[PDB]
Design a protein around this ligand. Structure first.
Ligand SMILES: NC(=O)c1ccc[n+]([C@@H]2O[C@H](COP(=O)([O-])OP(=O)(O)OC[C@H]3O[C@@H](n4cnc5c(N)ncnc54)[C@H](O)[C@@H]3O)[C@@H](O)[C@H]2O)c1
Ligand SMILES: NC(=O)c1ccc[n+]([C@@H]2O[C@H](COP(=O)([O-])OP(=O)(O)OC[C@H]3O[C@@H](n4cnc5c(N)ncnc54)[C@H](O)[C@@H]3O)[C@@H](O)[C@H]2O)c1
Ligand SMILES: NC(=O)c1ccc[n+]([C@@H]2O[C@H](COP(=O)([O-])OP(=O)(O)OC[C@H]3O[C@@H](n4cnc5c(N)ncnc54)[C@H](O)[C@@H]3O)[C@@H](O)[C@H]2O)c1
Ligand SMILES: NC(=O)c1ccc[n+]([C@@H]2O[C@H](COP(=O)([O-])OP(=O)(O)OC[C@H]3O[C@@H](n4cnc5c(N)ncnc54)[C@H](O)[C@@H]3O)[C@@H](O)[C@H]2O)c1
Lengths: 358, 358, 358, 358
């Protein structure tokens, strides 16, 4: 993909940078030109980059410098040799130095430009392709790697969406259920979810979501989800046969899916279980994973899979002799894996604008 | 019920004593003679009784003294005027002074005599009726109030069991389903549960449940449950049609039930909603309640209902135009409500041994 | 104080309204005319008023309505019979309808006009007396009740400040030290503090306090404090003899002060203990309290004292035979008590503008 | 040290094993023969060894096998090539197969044999030297590496103590204060401490420490310490000039020291600060560490120093122009570093019974 920019430098924007460093690609394949956020103090950025409450220390050298010598405060990050420019946040993306800086693919991480025309200002700033790191609205095309990232059309798709974190976990499960031919005549899902950057420490103000403003670490907070819905988007086979809800509980990372569906033919949990495990070793490799150990949420932190099927949980917990009525359980680190998928899409698209394959 | 004894004085045994007190029954109707635990320092008991990290300060006067004046340390609780005797914990219940203290109904709260013959040792110490405040085994009778407490037979049942907390929350749900004639042909359930006194603070030893031993306030911990199972005991109609699992999340009290079921004949969530709200006002009154405000877990503390139906959560989150495939959400304060049902059971059983009716 | 207005309706502004209500002063003595925040949906206010994750459910009747019937959504709170007006938040306080609504004492609770000229804009909107519910700057007068509230001068002070919470807890401590004649020649202090509405749930952006931005419920976070500092303002006697720091620990409410000081003339902790317990019963009554039970943080919730002296903790933990080198431990519910002092200050100031004395 | 046994396999016993693996010494220098705990299911042990809620995954291969082929369940751990025997827990250490198994130094981690004669049963089981991983009583000799581990006398000291975790953090600080000649005429200390394996998840039973049985993750719990006291033991210069207390707050690892002392000569914080930093690079190397970044508790997890001096915290927070009255701040991961020190003592002692130096 080579020339890359990053809009909004926190958590995902931070984990996204990090993945492409950890996967050894910075300055051989992907060239992060600049990052942009609510400032340009390059050493806060370096502080944020080295020390993380959940995922741990950065395993790389972080350094700072000034572009030009009339600056006041260092304005460039120098990660493992490479120079990335800190740029000053803008209320409207049209005012980004994209074309000038020499950026062609930009990655959206603010959370303020979900609507497709909004994010489209990046193109107008001389950016060339936009990937919205969340569920976009207004006719942006949604991709879920390993389920439908082959629909990507270099001529058609210009501002795209990489879906949600929960959509990315649910989608790979439904795909092999449909493809190996068990089916979903209908389905319902819960997600037990870690708290995020949009919750408050103490009872706060949330005038659209009343329940969401309440004290984050003191509660279980029922909440809504669009994850299922969007699946229909990515697998149009399944439109309006699925839905769900979310509970937010006081854990700082990692989350899980609880899927209850009715099948299209007579099976057993035993046969589904075996199908899944095997897609792990074949076509869904490195997207879908699986486990048969007795693990807890702590144990998937920094796990770069999109979806990890908990085998004993499922087998242990369905009705015996049943033929259609099944539940499935699947983990996912909501920051880490999704962030990898963001880089995965970016390389794919590039390669495909015949921006050199890999 | 007049003469009562309590075996194991913590959490449940503490909540249970407190219940009958707040419900004003101590010394008019129920007569707590003695309690027993891992000692006989009555002031540690009083300290334990007056201050609680979750439910708050005791609204009653606590006081200690000694039975006879050659004792060493006070051994009688003097609550709001009444004199309860602190009694020394025993490895074997057949060694309790039940007959002698003059105790006839005894409340098992240790967690150590769930097996019917074990818990029968109380009858052997001169005790007369024994309620197990937890799912028993070995042919002890299981009761759920407002669901089947009327099958109680003064002649037949002497060691009985008031189910579990989750069984007491799910049970009334399914009840009015079957009754108002919706049916459950097949059902699956999840409960997101607060942690308990059997988890560990840090990674611990749990050779029976490996996942249970992990650090409790740092994890989501999948776990099993017999709760649905036991429902078919209480409503035989539904034997072998129900099952589910639990998730232990880092909250100290309150929990929630997520039921997903398939109806027996066509309906709409609209009508199921209504039927549930009516049952609240009629036959299931004070057992099952409902809410249509935007409450979170913390809002259910010290709520003495068995099951509380969350209406917005439900209505918001089902499929449109659906006939048979439905999901229901119900809250419950896992300590409190269950402690009140325990008292409710003792009284019923009492009046029924023509131990004077109310 | 009769006519009152409140600026910023959360936590403190919510606790402050609640205080005068529980202390039965709404509509006899104090007259809350209007409140103002980031909107005017009076039912979100009522939802906010009735349910609290820490302090519990409102013991009063909450109700909403509209001022005039061309409004769109209810805009008046109707608490226990009284009609408060919801008023639209303003970037600049000189744009408040103070004069017009007929408001004379206004309570600043936003956290945005600490600078004396800024907070003076209220006088400019027709308001008459302004209390800053947080340490102010720029020559605003600082008061601490039961320590120096008597220096208040109806003619002199118009924009005033009720200190901080920690300043309100430490201050009374040092007071009776100096008075009973022990002296402080030099002192240092730590407070172990609960987290607040300015921390972040996950690793966040805090370019001013770098350590402050880190995940709040996962850390011990050293931090500074001006609390001792401001003490020399309130007791000038001790200027430049005090200082200390804070540690932010993962609890939602309540905090503690750990004072270490050097006396002016010989004594024993035994005598210091006694003097403190007496002051509780005499001149500092209702401000400073004490305890000699084995209470933990949770036991201080909704405790309306300014400072609570932990006697066992202190006596247990000083050097034997020591004359001058001493450590003192005092608790405090950082939200609640301070909200009550704020009301206490308004009344005092009121009566003093001969706004009728109590 | 070569032949080593381990009594009680959790947390320290686990972190102690782990250190000597991580420091590359298993089966070149230290030979762990067997471990012993509340069972002999070698694969739980392997589960406990690989997955840790706080510190992360084991970076090594874990495997299981049976000693002899009539066993029922694997009974040997096979870590990175090496075979360690799982042995069955005993109520009295005299009944350990120490001499037979071929063990000479054993490491005590149960917590049940602190009294010197109790732990001395290991010698009587054919063990040769005992190191109690905690503060022993009854005339065991206490060592604090890098402060007085040179007093060790191969002929005199047979059951020794490696002190406490807090004693290990405090001791290195006082040592360079005394040695560089600033002094301690007197001192007082607080420690803000992570919760441990002896706290309860919910209000529990703790009849010696009432405050310690309360709900661990919901409170700040004042507590007592012997740490200061024991310093006098290790630095007899300082006997009865020091004391302290502990607060336990809801964080699962890492803790910090707050030291307030009066010096023996006129100095400045600037000169102390410089002394410390420099002992880091000289004689106290790898025991005492230091930092001048803006870090929080999460950032020292798995930090193998005994004591880490927070430079900005101290400098930021003392009185200006002061000459005698000072506080110091210092971090420590309570499991990790202390566990390294345990191995450090063991090698030292060995080398010294002329069990071959290094
Ligand atoms: N963290 C997760 O679990 C997760 C998973 C999948 C998707 N997402 C999505 O990613 C997006 C970001 O989430 P987040 O948690 O990483 O957010 P943060 O972690 O809340 O990131 C937001 C950043 O935007 C910056 N910012 C705000 N306005 C800006 C502007 N005008 N210009 C530049 N920067 C600006 C902020 O300074 C901040 O650093 C969301 O929209 C969310 O839907 C999050
Ligand atoms: N609070 C809940 O979530 C809940 C709800 C429903 C049922 N229950 C059940 O009730 C039982 C008690 O749980 P708990 O939470 O109160 O446990 P705790 O809260 O762990 O109660 C146990 C008490 O029993 C005492 N004890 C142990 N052995 C004893 C003996 N031989 N004689 C006398 N006292 C003895 C202990 O000292 C302790 O005080 C369990 O079996 C549990 O399944 C709990
Ligand atoms: N609870 C405590 O620990 C405590 C104790 C003593 C003092 N204080 C102080 O009181 C102040 C408030 O703290 P807080 O905890 O209540 O904050 P919140 O709890 O964060 O309160 C802030 C409220 O102000 C509102 N607001 C913001 N801008 C506004 C505007 N321009 N007009 C009207 N309303 C506006 C916000 O919507 C929000 O509702 C702070 O300055 C703080 O220092 C807090
Ligand atoms: N974890 C810390 O922060 C820390 C730091 C310094 C010192 N320590 C000390 O280490 C000791 C252990 O603490 P811990 O937290 O690691 O304990 P755990 O983590 O509570 O370890 C105790 C182990 O002892 C085992 N056990 C009990 N009885 C036994 C027996 N008869 N034979 C063999 N094994 C037995 C248990 O199964 C358990 O695994 C304590 O005495 C404490 O003083 C702890």
């Amino acid at each position: 993909t080579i020339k890359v920019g990053i809009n909004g430098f926190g958590r995902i924007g931070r984990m996204v940078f990090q993945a492409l460093c950890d996967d050894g690609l910075l300055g051989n394949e992907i060239d992060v030109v600049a990052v942009v956020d609510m400032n340009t103090d390059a050493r806060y950025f370096a502080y944020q980059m080295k020390y993380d409450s959940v995922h741990g220390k950065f395993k790389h050298s972080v350094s700072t410098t000034k572009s030009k010598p009339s600056v006041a405060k260092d304005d460039t990050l120098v990660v493992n040799g490479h120079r990335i420019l800190c740029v000053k946040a803008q209320r409207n993306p049209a005012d980004l130095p994209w074309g000038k800086l020499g950026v062609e693919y930009v990655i959206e991480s603010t959370g303020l430009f979900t609507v497709k025309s909004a994010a489209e200002g990046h193109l107008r700033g001389g950016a060339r392709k936009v990937v919205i790191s969340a569920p976009a609205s207004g006719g942006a095309k949604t991709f879920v790697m390993g389920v439908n990232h082959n629909n990507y059309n270099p001529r058609e798709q210009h501002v795209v969406s990489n879906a949600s974190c929960t959509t990315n976990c649910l989608a790979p499960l439904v795909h092999v259920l449909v493809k190996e031919g068990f089916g979903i005549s209908t389905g319902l899902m819960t997600t037990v979810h870690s708290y995020t950057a949009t919750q408050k420490t103490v009872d706060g103000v949330s005038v659209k979501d009343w329940r969401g403003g309440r004290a984050a670490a003191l509660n279980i907070i029922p909440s809504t989800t669009g994850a299922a819905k969007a699946v229909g988007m990515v697998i149009p086979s399944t439109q309006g046969k699925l839905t769900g809800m979310a509970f937010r509980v006081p854990t700082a990372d990692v989350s899980v899916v609880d899927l209850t569906f009715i099948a299209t033919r007579d099976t057993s949990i035993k046969e589904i279980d075996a199908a899944l495990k095997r897609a792990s070793k074949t076509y869904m490799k490195n997207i879908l994973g699986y486990t048969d150990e007795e693990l807890v949420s702590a144990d998937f932190i920094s796990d770069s899979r999109s979806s990890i099927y908990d085998s004993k949980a499922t087998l242990q917990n369905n009705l015996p002799n049943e033929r259609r009525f099944f539940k499935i359980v699947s983990w996912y680190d909501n920051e880490w894996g999704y962030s990898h998928r963001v880089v995965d899409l970016v390389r794919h698209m590039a390669a495909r604008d015949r921006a050199a394959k890999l």
